[PDB]
UniProtKB/Swiss-Prot annotation:
Coiled coil: none annotated. It comes from Homo sapiens. Specifically expressed in the testis. Disulfide bonds: none annotated. It comes from the Eukaryota. Microtubule inner protein component of sperm flagellar doublet microtubules. Binds PARK7. Part of a ternary complex containing PARK7, EFCAB6/DJBP and AR. This is EF-hand calcium-binding domain-containing protein 6.
Length: 86
């Protein structure tokens, strides 16, 4: 249930605060056109490396908690602002 989802969010919080600069660089390297977004699949690739290799079900639920725009892309500066807060 909701607890499984919250455990993944806590691990995501820990990864962003521990590797802020490396995660920002990963977003910037995927965001070549500087639109302040990255794709759903690129975000999953970052999660695999920094948090854990999520199942399709876990990733679907994580994506539901992310700041996603109307074009299904991750608003990564909003993500960085929320997951780097103390």
């Amino acid at each position: 249930g909701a607890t499984a989802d919250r455990d993944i969010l806590a691990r995501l919080h820990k990864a962003v605060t521990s590797h802020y600069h490396a995660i920002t660089q990963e977003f910037e390297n995927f965001d070549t056109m500087k639109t302040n977004t990255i794709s759903r699949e690129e975000f999953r690739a970052i999660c695999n490396r920094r948090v854990q290799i999520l199942t399709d079900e876990q990733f679907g639920r994580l994506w539901n908690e992310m700041p996603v725009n109307a074009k299904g892309r991750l608003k990564y500066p909003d993500f960085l602002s929320r997951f780097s807060s103390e």
